[PDB]
RNA sequence: CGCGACCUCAGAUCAGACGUGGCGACCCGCUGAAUUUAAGCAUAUUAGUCAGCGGAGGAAAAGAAACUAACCAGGAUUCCCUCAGUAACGGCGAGUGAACAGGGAAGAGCCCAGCGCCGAAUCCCCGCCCCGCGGGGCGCGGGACAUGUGGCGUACGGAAG
RNA sequence: CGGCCCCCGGCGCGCGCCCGGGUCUUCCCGGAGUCGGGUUGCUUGGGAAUGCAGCCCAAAGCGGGUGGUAAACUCCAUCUA
């Protein structure tokens, strides 16, 4: 039975859900591009912190390379999303025998 | 096909490829004037999607600023008032040094219209900007009506009224609950607004 | 090197793009045949070269060049450095050819900081071979040998002049 | 300087209010001015109705305006799609067009393209040559009017959704009591709460 | 040793063209007090104003969302009435103080760099001819810009083959 | 109300341009010392910092920003600088 407030709040009215609009195609997969830094990476090099971070990580602590990253880089979850770039990056190319 | 593979070597620019050239190039520019024409851009992808086309009529300036917040012009560091205003040390100057460029270029030139400008070099002191200029009486500007808005008279001098990206960006000016001080117009617009004390005949 | 930049030069020479003249010529000669003698196909394919980095970085990415001439002496370096890890990513063979100016006044153009060769005729393919082969051999296979050696870091020849005679002077004193 | 039992006052004029006093002595000059752009917009421009583009049924965003409706800005592209013309071609026709507008409901959905439907049934229009495409010969006398006022359909249309005649029913009048809204109340304010002690509760096993 | 090409450049009373300065009531960018109030005075208020400096047009600025909202959702910018002397700021003292709704005038939307495809199919200049009133362009023949990237097709509302 | 002279607009003979809609398949899909973080000044009603700016650190691509009390996890709305 219909209200104002509660769980199910609100007038019902049927949804119209359809495919987005194509703004949200903004940040997506693009192989193309992906071809682009993936060639560039390894064209150019690294950044000194991420240098270091390769090594903090590798040898000396997680925690503290995401301290590092933290420091060097904005917030929490930036810190996050570089910590995983450099973790596969390092176990993909450090551990290929 | 190449401009992609610029931008993303251009982005990444603490890297070893890029931070040589860019020391070299900042040594480059130092040893040379403060105000003078570079006969083409050395960041193409960036001064193309700036508005650089490579045609007659465009013009880049390489321009030379002064890093660092400004002192008080006041002698002695006094100011004669309340302790309100004694910071002659501190004071950082709400407009960008980028800004600052493109009216040192645009008042060296008059006769050029400032479009957009942008960074090519720093080292501690000496902060590099370099300036596309369009010139609004060649002909090749004067046709091709997608570049005709700068030659009408109310684009004369936009680097100092605050017309281009980084005098927009000093401005403060968007859209969102983030800016209400310049609601609309200008900030003086605002306070113009909300400070006019409005009477009718009726009342 | 120059005999290999010669037999390139020898190769490329014949590859030219059209000017304006000879253009506007062909232009004026193929329309008054095809409105005289109504010609559906008189010509089947045009063999021509590609120039710039915007064209030369879509053929290598696409696998259209079969070979690839990078200029030298590009005043920005970054215009120019992705493109030989790129075509050798792609697999692409490339040589590295000193003077801009002498690519440009092979396109009538003052300068042209790219060539690619991607069509050939019937009687070159065997040149073509030869240089694309002593081109893998020089630049291609080499890559990895490439990418780890440094650049530069030499002295000015009169420190290296003061450091000889010191290392001179320390030979002395312990023989 | 305060006196017997008055209100406490806090003026605003402190900063300097007489150079800035904008009095409204145009304000007849104003109307006069827009009286005539409006006439002159009428005469001179078109044919076409004053306040030219036609508005959809819109519904205002708050707890307090959403029970009313407003004309809006425009026609919300897949509204426009559904109807079947193309953008700039509902530009031309007369249909104001706001790529922005989303949709969310199938009911205004189906109200607009109703209202598309309707405009699209009273259009007449005129092409240059008179070769008549998708029109006919001079219908109603050239339609007896060329301009329309205050909006085409006047967009307001505030439904009246009457329900009178009823009996009341069964236990439902005795079952949707006051009970319900705190019960209501009571559960969005500890629904998350309760999954977490459900959530230990699978935990602790 | 010399010649040539590119690139950085300098000179001229070189051919052509452009900015200076004035007014400044309205507008834009920077800067910037103190008298006054707080019955005293430092934070505060006066005020993001007066003064100073730089720009243009009959309007300028802004302007097509990195928006508002949080429900039956709206939808560029400006202006008025409301919101409201409210939320909030403040030796929480003096005082300062918006916004989204909502109703109205106006209503107009768009383009470019990237992505590739088109044999640079693009543009400026020079000279003679087709020619018009009070004046300047579609074609013809060669000197440049441009392949380190012209123009068409294209713009996040999807586009292209 | 009437006559003359002068100026601007919208009808109708030539010169120059001229392919959009729907179904299916394939492919493309984005603005960087920039956002953001720390710190310091000015400003705002904007408070665990509304906006602007100096110095330092300085990106991502199921990304980035906003969601008005700082922070972590998670879901959703909206936008695409
Ligand atoms: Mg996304
Ligand atoms: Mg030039
Ligand atoms: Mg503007
Ligand atoms: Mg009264
Ligand atoms: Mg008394
Ligand atoms: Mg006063
Ligand atoms: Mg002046
Ligand atoms: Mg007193
Ligand atoms: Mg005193
Ligand atoms: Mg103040
Ligand atoms: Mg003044
Ligand atoms: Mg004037
Ligand atoms: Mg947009
Ligand atoms: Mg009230
Ligand atoms: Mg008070
Ligand atoms: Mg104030
Ligand atoms: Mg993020
Ligand atoms: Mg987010
Ligand atoms: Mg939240
Ligand atoms: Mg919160």
Redesign the interface.
């Known amino acids: ?1 219909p ?5 199910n ?1 609100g007038h019902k ?4 859900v ?1 495919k987005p609009r194509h703004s949200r195609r903004r940040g997506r997969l693009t192989k193309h ?1 992906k071809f ?2 993936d ?2 990476r ?7 912190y991420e240098r270091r971070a390769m090594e903090l990580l590798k040898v000396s602590k997680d925690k503290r390379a995401l301290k590092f990253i933290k420091k060097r880089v904005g917030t929490h979850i930036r810190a996050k999303r570089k910590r995983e770039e450099l973790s596969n990056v390092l176990a993909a190319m450090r551990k290929a025998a | 096909g190449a401009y ?2 610029i931008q ?2 251009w982005r ?1 620019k ?5 931070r040589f050239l860019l020391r070299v190039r900042c040594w480059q520019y130092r040893q040379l004037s403060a105000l003078h024409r570079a006969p083409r851009p050395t960041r193409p992808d960036k001064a193309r999607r700036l508005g650089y086309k490579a045609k007659q009529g465009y013009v880049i300036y390489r321009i030379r600023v002064r890093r660092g917040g400004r002192k008080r012009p006041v002698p002695k560091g006094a100011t004669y008032g309340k302790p309100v205003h004694h910071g002659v040390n501190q004071l950082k100057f709400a407009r960008s040094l980028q800004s600052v460029a493109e009216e040192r270029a645009g008042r060296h030139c008059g006769a050029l219209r400032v479009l957009n400008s942008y960074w090519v070099g720093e080292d501690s002191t000496y902060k590099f900007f370099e300036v596309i200029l369009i010139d609004p009486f060649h002909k090749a500007i004067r046709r091709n009506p997608d570049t005709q808005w700068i030659t009408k008279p109310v684009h004369k001098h936009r680097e100092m009224r605050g017309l281009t990206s980084a005098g927009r960006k000093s401005r403060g000016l968007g859209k969102g609950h983030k800016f209400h001080h310049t609601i609309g117009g200008s900030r003086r617009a605002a306070w113009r607004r909300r400070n006019t004390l409005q009477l009718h005949r009726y009342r | 090197d120059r005999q290999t930049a010669t037999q390139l030069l020898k190769l490329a020479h014949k590859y030219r793009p059209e000017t304006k003249q000879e253009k506007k010529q062909r232009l004026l000669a193929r329309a008054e045949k095809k409105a005289a003698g109504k010609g559906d196909v008189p010509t089947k394919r045009p063999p021509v070269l590609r120039a710039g980095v915007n064209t030369v970085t879509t053929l290598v990415e696409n696998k259209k060049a079969q070979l690839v001439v990078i200029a030298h002496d590009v005043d920005p370096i970054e215009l120019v ?2 493109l030989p ?2 075509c050798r ?1 792609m697999g692409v063979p490339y040589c590295i050819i000193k003077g801009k100016a002498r690519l440009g006044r092979l396109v009538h153009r003052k300068t042209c900081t790219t060539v690619a060769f991607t069509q050939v005729n019937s009687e070159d393919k065997g040149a073509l071979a030869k240089l694309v082969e002593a081109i893998r051999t020089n630049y291609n296979d080499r890559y990895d040998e490439i990418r780890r050696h440094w650049g530069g870091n030499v002295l000015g020849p009169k420190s290296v002049a003061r450091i000889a005679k010191l290392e001179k002077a320390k030979a002395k004193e312990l023989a | 300087a305060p006196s017997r039992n008055g209100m406490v006052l806090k003026p605003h004029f402190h900063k300097d209010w007489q150079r800035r006093v904008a009095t409204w002595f145009n304000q007849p000059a104003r109307k006069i001015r827009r009286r005539k752009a409006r006439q002159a917009k009428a005469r001179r421009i078109a044919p076409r109705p004053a306040s030219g583009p036609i508005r959809p049924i819109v519904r205002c965003p708050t707890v307090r305006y959403h029970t009313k409706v407003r004309a809006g800005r425009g026609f919300s592209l ?1 509204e426009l799609r559904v109807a079947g013309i193309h953008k700039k071609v509902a530009r031309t026709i007369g249909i104001s067009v706001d790529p922005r507008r989303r ?5 205004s ?1 189906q109200a607009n393209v109703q209202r598309l439907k309707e405009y699209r049934s009273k259009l007449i229009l005129f092409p240059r040559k008179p070769s008549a495409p998708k029109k006919g010969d001079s219908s109603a006398e050239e339609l007896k009017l060329a301009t329309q006022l205050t909006g085409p359909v006047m967009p307001v249309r505030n439904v009246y959704k009457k329900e009178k005649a009823r009996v009341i029913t069964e236990e439902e009048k005795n079952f ?1 009591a006051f009970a ?2 705190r019960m ?2 009571a ?2 304010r500890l ?1 998350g709460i309760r999954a977490k002690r459900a959530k230990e509760a699978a935990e602790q096993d």
Not at chain 1, 42 to 48: I, L, N, R, T, Y
Request: charged fraction near 25%; proline fraction near 2%.
């Open positions: 039975y209200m104002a407030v509660g769980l709040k009215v049927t949804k119209n359809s591009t682009v830094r060639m560039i390894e064209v150019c090099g690294f950044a000194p | 992609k593979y993303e070597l990444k603490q890297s070893d490829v890029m | 450095v992705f890890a790129l990513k | 897949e949709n969310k409901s199938t009911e959905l949707k319900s809204l209501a109340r559960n969005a629904f």
